[PDB]
Amino acid sequence: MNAPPAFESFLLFEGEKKITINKDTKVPNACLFTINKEDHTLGNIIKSQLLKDPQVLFAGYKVPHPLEHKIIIRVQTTPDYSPQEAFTNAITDLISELSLLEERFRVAIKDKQEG
Amino acid sequence: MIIPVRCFTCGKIVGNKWEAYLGLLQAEYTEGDALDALGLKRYCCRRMLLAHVDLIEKLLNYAPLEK
Amino acid sequence: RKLRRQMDIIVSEVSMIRDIREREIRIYTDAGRICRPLLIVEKQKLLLKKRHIDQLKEREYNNYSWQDLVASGVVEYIDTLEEETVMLAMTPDDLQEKEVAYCSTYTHCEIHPSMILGVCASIIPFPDHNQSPRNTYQSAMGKQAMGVYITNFHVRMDTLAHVLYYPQKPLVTTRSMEYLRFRELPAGINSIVAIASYTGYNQEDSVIMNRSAVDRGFFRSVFYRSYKEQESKKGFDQEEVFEKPTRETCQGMRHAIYDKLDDDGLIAPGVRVSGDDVIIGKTVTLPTKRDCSTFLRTSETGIVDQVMVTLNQEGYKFCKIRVRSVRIPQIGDKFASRHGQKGTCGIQYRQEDMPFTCEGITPDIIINPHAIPSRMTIGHLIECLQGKVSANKGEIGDATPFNDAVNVQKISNLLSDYGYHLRGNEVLYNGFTGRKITSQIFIGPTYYQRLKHMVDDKIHSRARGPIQILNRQPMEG
Amino acid sequence: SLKQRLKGKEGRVRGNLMGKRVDFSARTVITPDPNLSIDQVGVPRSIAANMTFAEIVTPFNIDRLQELVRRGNSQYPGAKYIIRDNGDRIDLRFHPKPSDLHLQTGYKVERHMCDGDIVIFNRQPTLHKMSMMGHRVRILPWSTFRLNLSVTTPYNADFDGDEMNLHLPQSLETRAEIQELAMVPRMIVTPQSNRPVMGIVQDTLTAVRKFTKRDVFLERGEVMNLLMFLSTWDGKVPQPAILKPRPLWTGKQIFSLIIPGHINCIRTHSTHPDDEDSGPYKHISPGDTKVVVENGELIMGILCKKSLGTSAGSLVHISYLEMGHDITRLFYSNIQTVINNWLLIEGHTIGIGDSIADSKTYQDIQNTIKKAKQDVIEVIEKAHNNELEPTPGNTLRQTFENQVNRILNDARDKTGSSAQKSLSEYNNFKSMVVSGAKGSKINISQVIAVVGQQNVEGKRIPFGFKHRTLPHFIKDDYGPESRGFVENSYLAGLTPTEFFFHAMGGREGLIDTAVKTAETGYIQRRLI
Amino acid sequence: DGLKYSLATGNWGDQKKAHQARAGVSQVLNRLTFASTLSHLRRLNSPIGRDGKLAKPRQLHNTLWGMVCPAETPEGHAVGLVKNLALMAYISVGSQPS
Amino acid sequence: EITPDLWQEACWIVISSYFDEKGLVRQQLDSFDE
Amino acid sequence: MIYICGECHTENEIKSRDPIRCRECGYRIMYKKRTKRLVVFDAR
Amino acid sequence: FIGKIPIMLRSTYCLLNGLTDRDLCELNECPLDPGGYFIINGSEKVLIAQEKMATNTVYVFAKKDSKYAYTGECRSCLENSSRPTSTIWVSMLARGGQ
Amino acid sequence: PYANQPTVRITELTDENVKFIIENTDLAVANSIRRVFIAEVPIIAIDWVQIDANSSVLHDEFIAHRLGLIPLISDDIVDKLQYSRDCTCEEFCPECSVEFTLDVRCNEDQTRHVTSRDLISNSPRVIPVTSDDILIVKLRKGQELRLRAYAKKGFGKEHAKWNPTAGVAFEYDPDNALRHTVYPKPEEWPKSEYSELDEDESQAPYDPNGKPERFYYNVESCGSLRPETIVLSALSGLKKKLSDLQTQLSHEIQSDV
RNA sequence: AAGACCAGGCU
Ligand SMILES: [Mg+2]
Ligand SMILES: [Zn+2]
Ligand SMILES: [Zn+2]
Ligand SMILES: [Zn+2]
Structure with a gap:
């Protein structure tokens, strides 16, 4: 009787912003990203890509509660670089890697099928 | 009641293998050989056919309560 | 004793006792004496021989049975106070054969030591590897395990009937379950159980469940509620009638919807019925009319399954209605193994978040390892290993209590032949990050039972409701 | 007879004056939730929808109360009743009554129980005064009460078909009393035996020991995750114990960030032999088996029940006595969260x-x-x-x-x-x-x-x-x-x-x- | 009506003398599971009052071997007072000593 | 003549014969019939 | 009203105040056909 | 005609006695159902075996506070015909009398 | 400071199964790919069911539950179909649903097995996969089952019936060189089918400089989608999710700026 | 309505 519907895992309603950006006052050049209606699939990807950036000092994510569908990402970068720029660059690099992987997987499928 | 459509653990379809399993077991395959013949490799799909109880046959003995 | 064994003029139910020291001989033909069968031992040899076993193995189409076995003087019924004069041997092959002798005057031998257990305790695999309080807990909890209680349940009109979608016979079985007919009406499901501390939601006695498995029909069930209602004539002109009331004609009227009733004031089967819905419209002519219609139990949210109209003892119209609802297992619901390990469902994770083996197998149930060390239910672990062996072998394991032909080393040696670590451990990968788990987690199939107790039947809240008549205090219940 | 009406249990005096049935009470099954604080309790929405708290209209909250009245009893957060200055009760659950939905100072609006409300929470055998402590409501899906696992030992509760009672105070004064007297962090130390009542239990204690052994070396990403699960963290990454071959942190080094303030404590591990204190290696214990916390930092030692459990002179007891109830709460919660999330890696x-x-x-x-x-x-x-x-x-x-x-x-x-x-x-x-x-x-x-x-x-x-x-x-x-x-x-x-x-x-x-x-x-x- | 009442209500004796009549006999058959039905059909009850704090009649006696299940009893005030029958146990029906 | 450590088959055969003849509720049925 | 019989499965035409005995066979048990109005299920 | 006696299901006087699987299925009766219960007003009622002390046998016990050091008794019954449940006691008065 | 350059080898490719190796990529990449294999790949499954007559011994939602678990050939039109929540119409149409009809009656004496072959669809591309046959229900003589069913588009997050896959095997570092797992007794553990070491040695020597680097895969299809196209759809879906975050995150940066 | 008995659950 209290079961939530099947779609709160994957779907926004009126008023929910997919991403919310809040600055962190504890440490300079630190930001906090809130991603609504996402899970580990995307947070782990983004954190792993961000840890490769030499100008990123901190990168981590968590699910505040498993029964809720929400991701929080904290990014701290060096002084002459914005964590927003770090986030955009990580996303672009991930997309670029995935496109190349897709093309090479298609080439491998075609080579496997016609011998 | 009746064989489940999917294995609960992995999701392989075992709903179309009950009759073939029964036929092989009647044709003198043992349970282990029959499961291998049907193509059920890992223990999660094997337990489905190995531990199934077909009560739907018992339920079909009773006359329907309508025409 | 010769005449009793020949059944000549002394019935086998008569017990005879000689107390040598007090010089008394007592014979009881009285009713109510409890007794059990035993094999007769003459000298050091059983009277049961290979021809008896051959005839009993050819029992079909030979009209040779346990009564013919009794009539041959092979087995004997012995009650409690005759056992005082009996020298019993636990097994023939062990205690009859010559050793550095304890005794040589054995007079009887047990059929099998596992016959000392009851009906509910005979379903426990490896009961001699568990603690006795846990065996008692399992004996009590087995009566609450849900399943198919009787095959003709679709005919029966019973209140509070629970039936399970996909019962399975246990992969690890006791030799005595065949005589309890547990194969024909199973009360549980074999499930892949991993004993690990995953996310802290299975701590204490809780369980993590696989939501993807639950979506495939895992431990899904149906609950049937039956409703009785009676037409009667009590007053001279005061009578009860099944009819569909009009909106403001009767005195009693609730804002509930009467639109679902038929011409005779009975909901037809197949109609979805929720809270406050009127299943039976019964009006009592007020000497205009009083509404004694019956409602559903609050939030039952079911569907009318069967409607029956008859005549009772007196001859008035009588009606039974059966409502069903499906209940999919939730967080608050109670689950238990065959070893006394009971627990609610702490949380449900989809298949993506569950830990997985190299083969893609994910556990259906995850239980905390902390339930094992203090409760000392080793039979659970041995069952888990034996079921893993059996699912690969294609056979059904034998867990009869006191058999020396099964031990943990032999089960491990058998399991090692199928490409698995011989103690049941297996390398698991984290579901969230994909990294390996440093420890190797004990996994395997174990028989689990869903219990009658569910959170939907226990949750309750109150704010300024009904008031007791005499104390002007809140109601009970 | 009248004697029988008044005499026994369930008679008038004992059964209706000393104890009686009450309103605004809820019961359901309890399930664990390690993501809650030690003073929080998870409450299903249906119970929170049924249960109400009367609130007085003021110029500060009149807009919010009007929004709640417009939401009504259909949508989850709104009001169920409106009570006028004359005591007349207006019911919002049956009909919209748009002329009656007006609010003014002095009215009482009975809103639905929301996040942050204060409730007494109880388990029935009720043996000492820690069996009833005030909790803080957090609203969660499904139908079970959820509570932190360190709170289980005060109630003697385990998650096996156990049900617990929920009492909601209905007045501001009694809410203030529960907040100021019976809150969970104020009940950490019992006057019965001057010991802490709550401790680290189950997965978390075993993970504490295995984490605080010497062999635990943590990589950069693992450290960042564990710090992400710290609530009191200042945001500065400590310098790793090992630098050049690779940067490697230690479990004690991260546990020192969990330890609040500047706490000085000395305990001994369970496996501590008595030979080490006599001869050499008194202060450089070879088995790692003496515990030294100086200036709020774990210098050496393996933690166990004798350090984080419920015993006199424990680390938690000293933390309470030095820092007070508010900081000890965060100490329990941080230990729980960060060490469960580390145990996700090693497993047990x-x-x-x-x-x-x-x-x-x-x-x-x-x-x-x-x-x-x-x-x-x-x-x-x-x-x-x-x-x-x-x-x-x-x-x-x-x-x-x-x-x-x-x-x-x-x-x-x-x-x-x-x-x-x-x-x-x-x-x-x-x-x-x-x-x-x-x-x-x-x-x-x-x-x-x-x-x-x-x-x-x-x-x-x-x-x-x-x-x-x-x-x-x-x-x-x-x-x-x-x-x-x-x-x-x-x-x-x-x-x-x-x-x-x-x-x-x-x-x-x-x-x-x-x-x-x-x-x-x-x-x-x-x-x- | 005497047979019908004493089998329906469970009070074993005259309805007018119900105070002296023994109660608890003839419960409603348990249909939750087949094992539950079998255990209910094979069950024994000690007439000793449930309120008695004397432990002696509740303990598992040696003479229960092979006759009464050692594992199966209810938990609560009736520990050891409600006993189930062993699988091979048989209760004598009685005969005349002629 | 003697069963030579075939005993596990033999004892369960005789138990099967017993339960095939009597069943589980004979104490109810025998008592009522008598 | 249309009532299926409990032993012989013949439907009866019947009305209020008619005592229940089946026209074909005299049996006293009747069942009400599942209604005509439709109910929607999710296949979840 | 002096009355009606309820019948235990599947007994020698039940209508299900000696029927086969086909007959039981035609009767909408489960073959796996053991019987051994009654049907009273539509409900299923099961008589629970009642434990009791044996009769016609001499027993000797020792009470703590009683006037007697030893108490022999014999709960006697006339073959369960005309049964009065008559008990004699034969007791030895305690020597501790002052 | 930059993206991977991964490579793919494919070893086995059948109608049921795809074994492929992804080299030179992150562990998080591989885990998210195998996770998207289960939960983010769209497929067609029966979701709305209306039953007209059901005189079988299984109840209405029992039969409806079985119907939803029957796989449907999703190979072609799942890219063409809309989600129902995105469709422009008020009620079921060919751009957002597929109609199925079932009508079986048992007139003959011998028992009839109602199988997935008895399901009849309005369009030829989306037959049930099994066309042995998946058994829905058995009918005695005189029993009847008539119903209508509409199939929609969803993915594994919603319900396990929308899982396109029959278990994904995933493995990396078959010889335990990174020591991500610690064997108390290495000699007791069977070797992986991808192991590259001799029969005599138990584990590879410890590699302090290594990082997880080859991911071994084995995607087994349930029949709705070919295992070759499951991976492509998963990759495209993950890329689309990342592109949707890039898009909405660009707007949130512009809102702060 | 109310009273009675019984069964089960958590300590
Ligand atoms: Mg408990
Ligand atoms: Zn499987
Ligand atoms: Zn008829
Ligand atoms: Zn459309």
């Missing part, structure tokens, strides 16, 4: 290989059992030939039983010690017993080596039949096997007679548990 389990011992250990155990049985046979033979001399103040039967019990207890203790010595460092039974999370050295001994003697009414198994215990034994048999000594272990399995004797042994415990409760409760009531 139990299995058959944890209960199987070495082949040489099995031979040693069998030799010890055979020697003990031969000694009991020799003692029986000494009594049979009347060579046994009776001990002062004791009967011949009493001294015979004392000697046999001494022999069997020595045998069981020696076998248990051998089994405990045979355990490896990776054994999960040892990992659970040493940390004090659950289980014990006698449980390990009974699992691996020998279940031991079975006793009924504090005596060895009696003669229910004429001069014997079972029809399988001969009359006048005082040997260990006949009188209930279980030679086998749980792993090996019990013989039929030993199984029956163990059932007899457990029946006594069940009976005692069922019987003692009435007398204990009657004593408690009379004392109160």
Whole structure:
């Protein structure tokens, strides 16, 4: 009787912003990203890509509660670089890697099928 | 009641293998050989056919309560 | 004793006792004496021989049975106070054969030591590897395990009937379950159980469940509620009638919807019925009319399954209605193994978040390892290993209590032949990050039972409701 | 009669004046939630929808109360009733009544219970005043009450079909009382024994020990995750213990960030020997087995039940006494969250290989059992030939039983010690017993080596039949096997007679548990 | 009506003398599971009052071997007072000593 | 003549014969019939 | 009203105040056909 | 006609006695159902075996506070015909009398 | 400072199964790919069911539950179909649903097995996969089952019936060189089918400089989608999710700026 | 309505 519907895992309603950006006052050049209606699939990807950036000092994510569908990402970068720029660059690099992987997987499928 | 459509653990379809399993077991395959013949490799799909109880046959003995 | 064994003029139910020291001989033909069968031992040899076993193995189409076995003087019924004069041997092959002798005057031998257990305790695999309080807990909890209680349940009109979608016979079985007919009406499901501390939601006695498995029909069930209602004539002109009331004609009227009733004031089967819905419209002519219609139990949210109209003892119209609802297992619901390990469902994770083996197998149930060390239910672990062996072998394991032909080393040696670590451990990968788990987690199939107790039947809240008549205090219940 | 109306329990005085049924109360099953704070409780929406709190309209909250009244009883957060200055009650649940939805200062709006509300939470056997503590409401899906696991030991609750009661105070004054008096962080230390009541329990304690060992080296991403799960973290990454080959942090180095303020404490691990304090290496313990926390930093040592548990002078107790209730709450929550999330990496389990011992250990155990049985046979033979001399103040039967019990207890203790010595460092039974999370050295001994003697009414198994215990034994048999000594272990399995004797042994415990409760409760009531 | 009432209500005796009549006999058959039905059909009850704090009649006696299940009893005030029958146990029906 | 350590088959055969003849509720039925 | 019989499965035409005995066979048990109005299920 | 006696299901006087699987299925009766219960007003009622002390046998016990050091008794019944449940006691008065 | 350059080898490719190896990529990449294999791949499954007559011994939602678990050939039109929540119409149409009809009656004496072959669809591309046959229900003589069913588009997050896959095997570092797992006794553990070491040695020597680097895969299809196209759809879906975050995150940066 | 008995659950 209290079961939530099947779609709160994957779907926004009126008023929910997919991403919310809040600055962190504890440490300079630190930001906090809130991603609504996402899970580990995307947070782990983004954190792993961000840890490769030499100008990123901190990168981590968590699910505040498993029964809720929400991701929080904290990014701290060096002084002459914005964590927003770090986030955009990580996303672009991930997309670029995935496109190349897709093309090479298609080439491998075609080579496997016609011998 | 009746064989489940999917294995609960992995999701392989075992709903179309009950009759073939029964036929092989009647044709003198043992349970282990029959499961291998049907193509059920890992223990999660094997337990489905190995531990199934077909009560739907018992339920079909009773006359329907309508025409 | 010769005449009793020949059944000549002394019935086998008569017990005879000689107390040598007090010089008394007592014979009881009285009713109510409890007794059990035993094999007769003459000298050091059983009277049961290979021809008896051959005839009993050819029992079909030979009209040779346990009564013919009794009539041959092979087995004997012995009650409690005759056992005082009996020298019993636990097994023939062990205690009859010559050793550095304890005794040589054995007079009887047990059929099998596992016959000392009851009906509910005979379903426990490896009961001699568990603690006795846990065996008692399992004996009590087995009566609450849900399943198919009787095959003709679709005919029966019973209140509070629970039936399970996909019962399975246990992969690890006791030799005595065949005589309890547990194969024909199973009360549980074999499930892949991993004993690990995953996310802290299975701590204490809780369980993590696989939501993807639950979506495939895992431990899904149906609950049937039956409703009785009676037409009667009590007053001279005061009578009860099944009819569909009009909106403001009767005195009693609730804002509930009467639109679902038929011409005779009975909901037809197949109609979805929720809270406050009127299943039976019964009006009592007020000497205009009083509404004694019956409602559903609050939030039952079911569907009318069967409607029956008859005549009772007196001859008035009588009606039974059966409502069903499906209940999919939730967080608050109670689950238990065959070893006394009971627990609610702490949380449900989809298949993506569950830990997985190299083969893609994910556990259906995850239980905390902390339930094992203090409760000392080793039979659970041995069952888990034996079921893993059996699912690969294609056979059904034998867990009869006191058999020396099964031990943990032999089960491990058998399991090692199928490409698995011989103690049941297996390398698991984290579901969230994909990294390996440093420890190797004990996994395997174990028989689990869903219990009658569910959170939907226990949750309750109150704010300024009904008031007791005499104390002007809140109601009970 | 009237005497019967007033006299007994459920009579007027005791059943309707000293205790009575109340409104605004809820009951349901409790399930764990390690993501809640120690003062928070998870509440289902249906219960929170039914339960209401009357709130007075002021110029500060009039807009919010009007929004709640517009939402009404259909949508989850709104009002159920509106109460006028004259006491007339307006119901919003049946009809929209748009003329009556007007609000002014002085009205009372009965809103639905929201996040942040204060509730008393209770478990029924109700033995001391920590059985009822005030919690802070957090609203969660599904239909079970959820609470932190350190709070389980105050209530004596486990998550096995257990239900707990929820009381919601209905006035601001009583809300203030519960907040200021009975909140969970204010009840950490009991006045009964001046000890902390809540402690680190279950997965978290074993993970504490395994995390705080010397061998734990944490990589950069793992450190960032664990710091992401810290609520009191200042945001500065500490310099790793190891720098150049690769940057490597240590478990103690991250545990020092969990430890609040500047706390000074010295404890000892469970496996601490007494030899280290005498000779050298007093301050450089080779086994890592002394605990030193200086200036709020863990310098050396392995934590266990003796450091994070509920005992006098524990780290949690010292933290409470130095820092107060508000900081100790965050200390419990941070320990829980960060160490569960680290245990996600290493994992913990139990299995058959944890209960199987070495082949040489099995031979040693069998030799010890055979020697003990031969000694009991020799003692029986000494009594049979009347060579046994009776001990002062004791009967011949009493001294015979004392000697046999001494022999069997020595045998069981020696076998248990051998089994405990045979355990490896990776054994999960040892990992659970040493940390004090659950289980014990006698449980390990009974699992691996020998279940031991079975006793009924504090005596060895009696003669229910004429001069014997079972029809399988001969009359006048005082040997260990006949009188209930279980030679086998749980792993090996019990013989039929030993199984029956163990059932007899457990029946006594069940009976005692069922019987003692009435007398204990009657004593408690009379004392109160 | 005497047979019908004493089998329906469970009070074993005259309805007017119900105070002296023994109660608890003839419960409603348990249909939750087949094992539950079998255990209910094979069950024994000690007439000793449930309120008695005396432990002695509740303990597992040696003479229950092979006759009464050692594992199966309810938990609560009726520990050891409600006993189930062993699988091979048979209760004598009685005969005349002529 | 003697069963030579075929005993596990033999004892369960005789148990099967017993339960095939009597069943589980004979104490109810025998008592009522008598 | 249309009532299926409990032993012989013949439907009866019947009305209020008619005592229940089946026209074909005299049996006293009747069942009400599942209604005509439709109910929607999710296949979850 | 003097009355109606309820019938235990599947007994020698039940209508299900000696029927086969096909007959039981035609009767909408489960073959696996053991019987051994009654049907009273539509409900299923099961008589629970009642334990009791044996009759016609001499027993000797010792009470703590009683005037008697030893108390022998014999709960006697006339073959369960005309049964009065008559009990004689034969007791030995305690020597501790001052 | 930059993206991977991964490579793919494919070893086995059948109608049921795809074994492929992904080299030179992150562990998080591989885990998210195998996770998207289960939960983010769209497929067609029966979701709305209306039953007209059901005189079988299984109840209405029992039969409806079985119907939803029957796989449907999703190979072609799952890219063409809309989600129902995105469709422009008020009620079921060919751009957002597929209609199925079942009508079986048992007139003959011998028992009839109602199988997935008895399901009839309005369009030829989306037959049930099994066309042995998946058994829905058995009918005695005189029993009847008539119903209508509409199939929609969803993915594994919603319900396990929308899982396109029959278990994904995933493995990396078959010889335990990174020591991500610690064997108390290495000699007791069977070797992986991808192990590259001799019969005599148990584990590879410890590699302090290594990082997880080859991911071994084995995607087994349930029949709705070919195992070759399951991976492509998963990759495209993950890329689309990342592109949707890039898009909406660019707007949130512009809102702060 | 109310009263009675019984069964089960958590300590
Ligand atoms: Mg509990
Ligand atoms: Zn499977
Ligand atoms: Zn008819
Ligand atoms: Zn459309």
